[PDB]
Amino acid sequence: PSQFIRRDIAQTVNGSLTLTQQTNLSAPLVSSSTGEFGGSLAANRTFTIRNTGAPTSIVFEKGPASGANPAQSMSIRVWGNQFGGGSDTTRSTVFEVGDDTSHHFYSQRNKDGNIAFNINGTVMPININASGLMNVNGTATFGRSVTANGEFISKSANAFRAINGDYGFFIRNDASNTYFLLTAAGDQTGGFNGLRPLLINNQSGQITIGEGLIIAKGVTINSGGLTVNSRIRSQGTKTSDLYTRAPTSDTVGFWSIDINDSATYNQFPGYFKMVEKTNEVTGLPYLERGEEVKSPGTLTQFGNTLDSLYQDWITYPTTPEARTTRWTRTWQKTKNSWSSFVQVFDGGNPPQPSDIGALPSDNATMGNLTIRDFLRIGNVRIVPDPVNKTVKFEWV
Amino acid sequence: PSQFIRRDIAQTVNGSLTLTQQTNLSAPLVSSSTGEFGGSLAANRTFTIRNTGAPTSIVFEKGPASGANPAQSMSIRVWGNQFGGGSDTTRSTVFEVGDDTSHHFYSQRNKDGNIAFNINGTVMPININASGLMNVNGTATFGRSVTANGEFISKSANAFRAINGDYGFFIRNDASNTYFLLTAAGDQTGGFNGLRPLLINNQSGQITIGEGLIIAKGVTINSGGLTVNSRIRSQGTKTSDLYTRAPTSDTVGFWSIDINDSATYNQFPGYFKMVEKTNEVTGLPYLERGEEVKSPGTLTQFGNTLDSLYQDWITYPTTPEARTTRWTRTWQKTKNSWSSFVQVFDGGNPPQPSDIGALPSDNATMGNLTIRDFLRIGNVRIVPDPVNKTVKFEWVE
Amino acid sequence: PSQFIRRDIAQTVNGSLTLTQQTNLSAPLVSSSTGEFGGSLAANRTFTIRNTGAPTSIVFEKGPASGANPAQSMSIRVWGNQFGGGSDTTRSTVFEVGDDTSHHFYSQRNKDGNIAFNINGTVMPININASGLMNVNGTATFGRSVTANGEFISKSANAFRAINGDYGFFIRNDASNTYFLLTAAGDQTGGFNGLRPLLINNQSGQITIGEGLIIAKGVTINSGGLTVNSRIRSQGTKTSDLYTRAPTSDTVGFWSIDINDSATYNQFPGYFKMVEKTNEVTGLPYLERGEEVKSPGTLTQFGNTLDSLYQDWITYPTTPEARTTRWTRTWQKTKNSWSSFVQVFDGGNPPQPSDIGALPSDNATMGNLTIRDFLRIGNVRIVPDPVNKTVKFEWV
C-alpha cells in the first residue's frame, strides 16, 4: 500500500527512523522533546535555556577520574526566591556557580536592586581597586606602605606600634592616660615592660617623663615655676679670664664655677692666715689678719640682667693651715666694670680696729683723749677737782 | 514514482516531516537553520557558540514568577569594542554576566593586555589575598589588628588617633606645628579641646609642653641654659646627720632645707640675744651680744663639686623675742670635714669690741696707753713738757 | 525490493537526507555524533555537557574583527589535576574562564576542600565586605579614614608619618632609639633632616629633646635633681609692693629681681657714701660712713617654704661715684613680717666704732678709763707709786 513516506508533501512518520548518514537541514528543527548528542555541538550567535517553571542551568560533568578531569561536576544556575513564599524572598535574581559540595561563588541582585558578588572562600586578585567602602572583619597584613588621605583611628588600648630590631615601641591610650611604651627585648609584639618614658594625662594634658630627660639648646619655663628634688648643679662656663670677664646676655644668671687652677685663682683674692692675740686685761682672744695666701675657690654669680648681677668668691682650703674667706663684688654696667672684690667680715675673718677707726684695746697710741669723770692708773684715781681748779688724787 | 523517499541513496525531502517516534542518528547533523528543544539538551565535551558578525551569548530565561525562578532573565555575553570605531576602543575582550537591568559583573582584557574583573556592587569573600596593589576610595574599617611591613602615612591634618574610654588622643600636623592633642570627654572622634599637652615646631623642631611637666630620674640641660618664671624650689634631702654629713656626688649642688626639728637644729648655731646699750657721750645705741639660743633655720648649699661646695645657715624666729643670725661654712675635701660655722657680721649681729681687739667706748680697762698731744680730765689738760723731761697740768676753763 | 522508507515501522535510512522544510519532533532525538546549527539554538531547563574522558567546555567564538566582536575567543572550562596533569595534584575542581592568551579568572576547590577565586589582574568592586582575613602584598592607598578595632603595627623603621603642607612628621624606631622626626620643607615623603626634636632610648626609656624646650604651667622634678649648662635665670615676679609683700605659696623659692625704678628702690636701703680717712699715728686708712644714697639693686630670695625664707638686697651703682652695699632680711612667719633689712659688713662697708660700742681711734671723749700698767704722755710714763699714794713720772 501507501504506508511509505511521501517525499513532497507534509508527512507524519510513526516509525522510529535511524539515520545512518549525515542529515542536512535547511529549515527549523522544532521538538517538544529532548536532544542528546554523543559528539560535540555548535550553534550560531545565541543559545537560550528556556524556563517553563523551574530555574535553568548548565551542567559540566566530571567524567572519569582521569586525565584533566575535575573531582566533582559543576553547574551554573540562575534562580531566585522572590516568588517562593518562603521566609526569605529577598534573593531576586541569582547567578550561582558551584559543585556537588557547595557553591563556589554567586552574583545576585536583591529585592532592593543592589548587587552582591559572594565568594565562598579566598579571593586572590593581583590588584584591588574599590570605588566604595571596605570592611574586613579579620586580621589584616600589608607588605609595603599604607597611605590614607584621611585619619588612622584605633579603638585598641595599644593603638600604634613601631617594631624594629629587639624592640616594640607603642602608643597606649588606657582611657586614663596615654603612654609611650616599650617592650622587653625580643618581645616586640607583647606587653609593656616597667619603663615609663612618657605619659599624658587624658583629663589635664599634664605630661610625666619617667626615665630621665636630657635637653639641648635651652629650656624656658613660661609660667608656674620649677620644683627640684633634690639639687641643682648650675655649671658656669669656665674661661681663663673670669677675673676680668664682662658679663654678656649668654652668661648673666645664676651659676657656680670651681676655680681650681692656680693660673686663674692667683688672680682672685686669697684667704688670710689668722693670728690670735689676747687681751692683756681680760684674757679674751681676738683675731688679726696674717699673710694673704692665694687659694682655689668657688665663684658664684647671681642676677638675671646686664644691670643686675653680682658675684661671691668663696675660697676653699687645700692645706692644713688654710681657711675659708669670702669676697663679694657687683657688676657696674654704667662703668663697664666689676667693683673690686671686698672681704666679707665674719667670725673667722673679723674686721680689725684699724679697718674701722677704733682704738686698739691693748698697747694703743693716740693723739688726744678727753675723760669726763675719772682716770684710774693702778690704784690711784685721778678726778677733776674744780674747786682748787685742778685734779685730785685718790688711792683705792 | 519518485514522490517517495529512498532508503538507499541521497534524497532531498521537500515536505515537512513530523517524527512522532524517537529519532536515532549515527552521523553528523548539519543545519543552516535553528534548533528548538521543548525538553532538556545534552552534548559531549564541547559546546561552541559560533560568531558570524555579532557577539555570542547564552540566555537564561526567568520563566513564570513562581517557585525558585529569578525575577529577571540573565545572560553571559562575550563582546568587545576594539573594532567598533567609537571614542572607546579599549575594551578588547569582555565576558559579561548580567540581567535585564545592568551587568552584575564582567571580566575584561583591556587593549593594553591587562585584565580587570569588575563587580557592579559589593564583593563578599571570606579571605582576601592580593599579590599586587590595593586602592580603596571610601572609608575603611578593620575588625582586628593591621600590620604593615612598610610605613603608615596620613595626608590628613589629624593623622593618628587612639580612642579608649572617654577620650581620643591624636597627632595633628597642621603644616606649621605637630601637636599631641586630646578630645573632650565623650567626644572621642571629634576636635581638639583647649589642652595643649605637647607640640613640635615643624621648622625649628622646638618643643612646647603646655599643661605642666613632671620628670622622674633627673634632668640635664646640655646647652642653652635655663630661664624660669617665676621661682625655683630646690628642695634638699633632709637627714638627721646634716650637721656632720659629708657631701656625695648625689648631694652636691644648690638646694635649701628647712631645718625645723629641734633634734637637728640644736646641733646647729643659734641666734644671739642682743642687748641695746646707749653710748653715754653721743647717745647712739649699739648692740651687745648676749646668750646664744638654738633655733630652726634654713640650710642652703652652693657649689657643684666635692671640692667646691659651701653652706649658709640662716636662723628664723619662732618666738616673740627671737632674732635672726646667719652663719657660713665651707666643705674641706683635703680634711674630709666642713669648716666650723662662723657668724656673719651684719647690722643685726655686729662684731663686739672683744671679738676684734678694740677698746670699749666707756667704762674701759686696758694695760697701757700712749698719748702724743694731750689728755684732758675734767677741765685739766695734761700735755708733754719734754724740756723739763716731764708733763704739764693746765687748767683750761 | 523496498528501497523506500516505511511511514509506520522502525526503519534504517542509509542515504543522506536533506530536509528543506521545518522538521517537527515529538519524541527524543538521540545521536552518537555531532550537531551543527547555523542559526540560534534553544532547549528547555537544562543543558548538560557530558564528559567521557576530557574536560567539558563552552567556547565563545570571536568572529570577524568588526562591530562589537571581541579581539579573542573565550571559553569556560571545568577541569582539574587531581587525576593527572603534571606535578601538581591539588587543583581538584576548577571552573576557568579565559581567552586565547590566558585565564581571566577561575574558581576552584582544592584537594583539602577549600575554595579560591583567582582573578588574573585587578578586581574592581564598589564595596568590599570580607568576613575573614586580608593580605595585600603591594602598596596600599585609602581615600578616606581607616579605622581598626585592633592595633596598627609597622615593621618599618619609619613607622608612622603625618604629612601636611611643607612637612612630614614621623616616628622612627631605628632599633636603638625611637625618634620623632621632621623632613626638609617640600620633601614630605623623604628622610629626616638634621633636627632632633625628641628621642626615646629603647633600652633605658631616657628621653632627649634636641632643639629646645618651652614649658607652661610649671615643672616638677620628682627625683634625680637637675644639671644646667650654663646658667639659670630665675626671674621673680616684680610688683610695686616688694618691700612689704608677704610671701605666698606661689612666691616662695629662689629668684632674683632687678629693682631698677626709683618708686620701688627708694623704699629699699641705699648704699652709704664713704670717705677714706688715715689714722695719724699709724698711717693706716679706714672708711668713714656718710649719707645713705638710694640706689637700684638686685633683690634675691632663697628658701622654699612660708617658714624658711630670706632675702638679700644688693645695690648697684648707676652714677660715677656710687658704691655698692648688701643688706639682708629673714621672713618671720610667726610675726607675719620681714625682719628689718640690716647691712652686711664687708671691706667696702665696714662697721663704725658707733655700731659696736668701741672708742674711736682719736679725738675721743669718754666717761672713765682704767689703766693697769702705765699711761705715757709724750716720753713720760705715769705709773703708780705706792710709797706716796700717788703717781710717779718716769722719763723715757
Numbering used by the authors:
A (entry chain A), C (entry chain C): 893 to 1288
B (entry chain B): 893 to 1289
Manuscript excerpt for this entry:
The structure of gp34(894–1289) was determined using the single-wavelength anomalous dispersion method (SAD), using data from crystals of the P21 form grown from protein in which selenomethionine was incorporated. A high-multiplicity dataset measured to 2.0 Å resolution at the peak wavelength of selenium was collected and used for phase determination. Thirteen sites were found, where fifteen sites were expected (five internal methionines per monomer of the trimer). Manual fitting and refinement led to a final model consisting of 1189 residues (893–1288 of chain A, 893–1289 of chain B, and 893–1288 of chain C), plus seven glycerol molecules and 1620 water molecules (residue 893 is the final proline of the amino-terminal purification tag). Here, the refined model contained the same protein residues as before, plus seven glycerol molecules and 1312 water molecules.
The protein is a highly intertwined trimer containing a 2 nm-wide triple β-helix domain interspersed with three wider domains in which each of the monomers forms an anti-parallel β-sheet.
